[PDB]
Each structure stands twice: as structure tokens, then as C-alpha cells.
Design an enzyme around this catalytic site. Sequence first.
Site, short mmCIF file in Angstrom:
data_model
loop_
_atom_site.label_atom_id
_atom_site.label_comp_id
_atom_site.label_asym_id
_atom_site.label_seq_id
_atom_site.Cartn_x
_atom_site.Cartn_y
_atom_site.Cartn_z
N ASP A 1 -1.66 5.35 -5.04
CA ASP A 1 -2.17 4.77 -4.28
C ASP A 1 -2.36 3.38 -4.61
OD1 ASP A 1 -3.28 3.77 -1.96
OD2 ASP A 1 -4.74 5.26 -1.71
N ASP B 1 0.76 -1.28 0.03
CA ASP B 1 0.07 -0.01 -0.01
C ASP B 1 0.81 1.36 -0.13
OD1 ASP B 1 -2.10 1.91 -0.09
OD2 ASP B 1 -2.44 1.58 2.30
C1 LIG Z 1 -6.58 7.14 0.27
C2 LIG Z 1 -5.53 6.55 1.26
N1 LIG Z 1 -5.00 5.21 0.83
C3 LIG Z 1 -5.96 4.33 1.23
C4 LIG Z 1 -5.51 2.99 1.29
O1 LIG Z 1 -4.46 3.20 2.36
C5 LIG Z 1 -6.42 1.63 1.60
C6 LIG Z 1 -5.82 0.50 2.14
C7 LIG Z 1 -6.56 -0.61 2.32
C8 LIG Z 1 -6.58 -1.73 1.47
C9 LIG Z 1 -7.46 -2.86 1.58
C10 LIG Z 1 -8.45 -2.91 2.22
C11 LIG Z 1 -8.76 -1.66 2.79
C12 LIG Z 1 -7.98 -0.75 2.97
N2 LIG Z 1 -7.39 1.49 0.51
C13 LIG Z 1 -8.58 1.97 0.55
O2 LIG Z 1 -9.16 2.88 1.36
C14 LIG Z 1 -9.40 1.58 -0.60
C15 LIG Z 1 -9.28 0.11 -0.91
C16 LIG Z 1 -10.15 -0.31 -1.97
C17 LIG Z 1 -11.17 0.29 -2.38
C18 LIG Z 1 -11.20 1.87 -1.96
N3 LIG Z 1 -12.07 2.72 -2.79
C19 LIG Z 1 -13.09 3.45 -1.88
C20 LIG Z 1 -13.05 4.92 -1.81
C21 LIG Z 1 -13.79 5.35 -0.87
C22 LIG Z 1 -14.91 4.75 -0.02
C23 LIG Z 1 -15.05 3.17 -0.45
C24 LIG Z 1 -14.08 2.57 -1.37
S1 LIG Z 1 -12.26 2.65 -4.39
C25 LIG Z 1 -13.95 1.78 -4.44
O3 LIG Z 1 -12.88 4.06 -4.67
O4 LIG Z 1 -11.38 1.99 -5.10
C26 LIG Z 1 -10.56 2.43 -1.17
C27 LIG Z 1 -6.04 6.73 2.70
O5 LIG Z 1 -7.06 6.57 3.14
N4 LIG Z 1 -4.75 6.86 3.64
C28 LIG Z 1 -4.82 6.99 4.94
C29 LIG Z 1 -3.77 6.00 5.78
C30 LIG Z 1 -3.98 5.94 7.19
C31 LIG Z 1 -3.83 7.41 7.57
C32 LIG Z 1 -4.88 8.33 7.10
C33 LIG Z 1 -4.90 8.29 5.69
#
Ligand SMILES: C[C@H](NC[C@@H](O)[C@H](Cc1ccccc1)NC(=O)c1cccc(N(c2ccccc2)S(C)(=O)=O)c1)C(=O)NC1CCCCC1
Length: 372
Positions: free
Chosen positions: A215, A32
Site C-alpha cells: 500500500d 495509491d
Molecule cells: C488501508 C487501505 N489503504 C489506505 C490508503 O488508500 C489511504 C490513502 C490516503 C492517502 C493520503 C491521505 C489519506 C488517505 N491511506 C491511508 O489511509 C493512510 C495514509 C497515511 C497514513 C495512514 N496511517 C494511519 C492508519 C490508521 C489510522 C490513521 C493513520 S499510518 C500513520 O499508520 O501510516 C493511513 C484502505 O483503507 N483502503 C480503502 C480504500 C477505499 C475503500 C475501502 C478500503
Amino acid sequence: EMVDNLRGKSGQGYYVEMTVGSPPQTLNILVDTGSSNFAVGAAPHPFLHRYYQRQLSSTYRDLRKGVYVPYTQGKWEGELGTDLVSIPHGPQVTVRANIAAITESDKFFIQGSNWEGILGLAYAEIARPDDSLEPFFDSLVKQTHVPNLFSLQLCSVGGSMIIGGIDHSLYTGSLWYTPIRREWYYEVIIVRVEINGQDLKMDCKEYNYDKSIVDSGTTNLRLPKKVFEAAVKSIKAASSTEKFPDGFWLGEQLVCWQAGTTPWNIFPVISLYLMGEVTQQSFRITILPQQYLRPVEDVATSQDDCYKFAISQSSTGTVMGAVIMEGFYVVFDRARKRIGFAVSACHVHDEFRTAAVEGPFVTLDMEDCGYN
Ligand SMILES: C[C@H](NC[C@@H](O)[C@H](Cc1ccccc1)NC(=O)c1cccc(N(c2ccccc2)S(C)(=O)=O)c1)C(=O)NC1CCCCC1
């Protein structure tokens, strides 16, 4: 020996094998670039095949401090500690690193994903609880002779994470570099967006409102509302020979065609122009519909090929996720504060169109496209 060291299921991330503890406990860990915490399941969970057992590791050190990490999707809480960590199909080194032992979670672990933890490869500035929790890659560089660079080739799925170097067998053509604007996320600057060659014609700051990031942990290309709405209008226009329900464009509904008959040619190419390393120069990466219409495998629907629209709206800036990275070789050149893109050895293309990384392009307007 690092080539082909990643696996994954579509829409569920890419993961690398790691070991934690002494004696070593093998776990699959999601790669990630969008976070900076290394965390592993450390208690039973219905979707975990296995988990980190701290009591079995003589090298575990408890830091006596809890940690909570919320992502755009999912969240977890756990206990901080340190332990010995290895990457069997990466560099042949062992490092002592911070590890968050996940004791509770919500909508984080995925049913049948084959991974049990997450490797946040971004910078300390976004680590939780704060920037004093040294990220794994920082520890790796400090403790070994590994150069301060890694690359990702994301292609059931697979690919490669090459630590310390650039593997020329994984790409063709030229590597083009865009500057890392700020070392927190891997923040970059988009200067121009075209859909089938037609400029979206927005002030370029809109493309980076309020940041743009690379990302690997996010599936989709996510765009600021204004940009998302403009992009959907242009894609609808291009594909207007077929009409799809509103739910499709919102990513809430699949679109299906008789097996083998997907009309790729009615969907446009998307070009993202990234800031270059010289003033007012840029390069573009081009995204085919085979990238942004994500196949959803389901034996029940298998008379057809079905897809989710993998471009979606964001209120936290652009996210260049896995569907953008797939088919490019992406070099996270931390040493030189830049991200490189090249066409990957693994690419979809059809007989008419090919994903591309190309330049240089020059822009007359001297506006800085950074939002802040
Ligand atoms: C945005 C930034 N990076 C997010 C990433 O760290 C996170 C990792 C992850 C991987 C697998 C399962 C859960 C989490 N990925 C996601 O948040 C993620 C994963 C798959 C799909 C989506 N999408 C999404 C977007 C919004 C709502 C629901 C799903 S999608 C469908 O649009 O592709 C997001 C992040 O949040 N970093 C944080 C790290 C910790 C400190 C705060 C910042």
C-alpha cells in the site's frame, strides 16, 4: 521520460502529475496501491491550491451518481463522472476514465502537500460504490496498448512510476516475486518475520491476520496487534542501551538526537519473508532503521534530528506501506498476478548494513500462511 516523475513530502504520500478534461487541467495526484478510486478535489478547500472545474471541460460526462470513500485516514464524498485523462510524464496516451469529483471531505487533504487528488491503482473489487466502477489502470490497459504492469520506485522526496514496463536502471540485483493471493487489494503472504535475525516464532497465519497488503498510500508498516506487540518487544530489547517513552513506540511522540548523532546501530534490522512462486520457498526483504524511523522535518527542532516510529498497530491486517517500499523497486505485475521486489537504485544504507532482497529460503512446515 518516466524516470523521476514522482514527488512528495515525507509522510504525505507520493504524487504524479496528471491532466483531466478538455482543455487539460493539470493536477498532482497521489499514487495509491491501497485503493481503487480515481478522485480529485472539485470544489474549493483550504488546503487545495487548485481543483477540477467540471464546467470548463467539454468532455466531462456526469454519471448522475454520488460516491463515498472512507480510508483508514480521511474520507470524502463526491460525484461520479467520466473525462479524458493524461499523464504528461507517463505513457503518451489519453484515456477516458471514471473520476470522482470530491465535493466534501474530512481529514483527507493535507495542509501543504502539493497534491489535489488520488489515483487508486488496486482492483475493481474494492472500488466504491462497487466493482462495476472500472478503475483507472483497467481503463488505461483496455484503451491503449500499455502492458498490464506498473512499477514504483519510492525514494521533499521523489521517485518513479513506470507504467507498462520494468526499468532496469531503477534497481540492482535480482527481482524476487511473491504471488498476489487475491485481486482486490494487492494482497500478499508473509511467511516469516525476524528482528536482527531472531524469529518472532508465531504461527505464520498471525502475520496475515486478516490480510497483508502492499500500500503506497499508507505511510507506515502496520502490523496485526499480536505481531506489533511482539515486534516492539524485540526492537526495545535490541535498542535497550537507550530507553524511550511509551509514547514513542505508539507513534505519538518524536525521538530526537543532536544533529548528525542518530544511533542507527542500536536499532535492529527487520526481515519480512514473503511467499515465493514455488511451494514452501520464500525470499526476504530487509528493512533498516533508516526506513522505520521516519524523519520529521521542522525548522523549530532543527538543532536535532527527530523521528517518528513508523511501525504501528492495525486491526485490519498487515499494511506494507511507503516506509517498506522506499528503497525497493516494486513491480506490480498484474499480468502474471505477482509482485516483484528488488533493491532500488535509491537506497539509504550506512557503511555497516544494506537493505536487501534475497533468497531462496526453504521452510519445512507445510502450513499455508494465508489467514482465509
Ligand atoms: C488501508 C487501505 N489503504 C489506505 C490508503 O488508500 C489511504 C490513502 C490516503 C492517502 C493520503 C491521505 C489519506 C488517505 N491511506 C491511508 O489511509 C493512510 C495514509 C497515511 C497514513 C495512514 N496511517 C494511519 C492508519 C490508521 C489510522 C490513521 C493513520 S499510518 C500513520 O499508520 O501510516 C493511513 C484502505 O483503507 N483502503 C480503502 C480504500 C477505499 C475503500 C475501502 C478500503
